[PDB]
């Protein structure tokens, strides 16, 4: 890789600089280089990886949605191949980033992740990036892409329920995202609502065990669960 000659610590340092500079493509490239050094990632390093790639793919997804909406309107009752071509260009770039992230997870982050906090984190990411692939998929593999997202989220859920308290931020964020998967990918709004509600209620009951700082972390994600429930009901 293009980062193969840079020290791991220098890649991490530069990823943090890139985050301060809002240079998310660079941030993601630095973190990919760090992953490819072959050592496990710390909690902070996992967070950097996930923020970097989310910012990259988030811009691509937002652009894809704009272009898809224009393409839909241009195919209604009442201008050539350009809109489709450009939507396809953005789509292919987005798929490439998802494939890159999934490849880092498969080679070899997931297989080396034994602690619950790392294993759940990476399986959640795997579900998230298959979910982004599912948002744009239309071919013979669409159902398999959706099931790949589901299977990754489900394994992460099973581990999180056995090994983490209900207020753990990774567990909460996993539930938030898996609930969105149910709502808008799997066409299962009742499952989405049930998951968000039980997750919220079980976290509420465990807040009493937390310090002020942990309480702040957990309640922030709980508020997102509540926001989604308010939107959906």
């Amino acid at each position: 890789g293009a980062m193969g000659s840079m020290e791991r610590a220098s890649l991490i340092q530069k990823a943090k600089l890139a985050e301060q500079a809002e240079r998310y493509e660079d941030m993601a490239a630095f973190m990919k280089g760090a992953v490819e050094k072959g050592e496990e990632l710390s909690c902070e390093e996992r967070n950097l990886l996930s923020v970097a790639y989310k910012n990259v793919v988030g811009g691509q997804r937002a652009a894809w949605r704009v272009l898809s909406s224009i393409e839909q309107k241009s195919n209604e009752e009442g201008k050539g191949p350009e809109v489709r071509e450009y939507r396809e260009k953005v789509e292919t770039e987005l798929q490439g980033v998802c494939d890159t992230v999934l490849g880092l997870l498969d080679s070899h982050l997931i297989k080396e992740a034994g602690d619950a906090e790392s294993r759940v984190f990476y399986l959640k990411m795997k579900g998230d990036y298959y979910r982004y692939l599912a948002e744009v998929a239309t071919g013979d593999d669409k159902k398999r892409i959706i099931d790949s997202a589901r299977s990754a989220y489900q394994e992460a859920m099973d581990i999180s329920k056995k090994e983490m308290p209900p207020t753990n931020p990774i567990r909460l964020g996993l539930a938030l995202n898996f609930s969105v998967f149910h709502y808008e990918i799997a066409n299962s709004p009742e499952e989405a609502i049930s998951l968000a509600k039980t997750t919220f209620d079980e976290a509420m009951a465990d807040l009493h065990t937390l310090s002020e700082d942990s309480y702040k972390d957990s309640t922030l994600i709980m508020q997102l669960l509540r926001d989604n429930l308010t939107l959906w009901t």
């Binding site: 989310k54 988030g58 811009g59 709502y183 994600i221």
Partner: peptide, 9 residues
């Protein structure tokens, strides 16, 4: 719109 985490920006 509905929330997922991480968020961008």
């Amino acid at each position: 719109r509905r929330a997922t985490v991480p968020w961008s920006h």
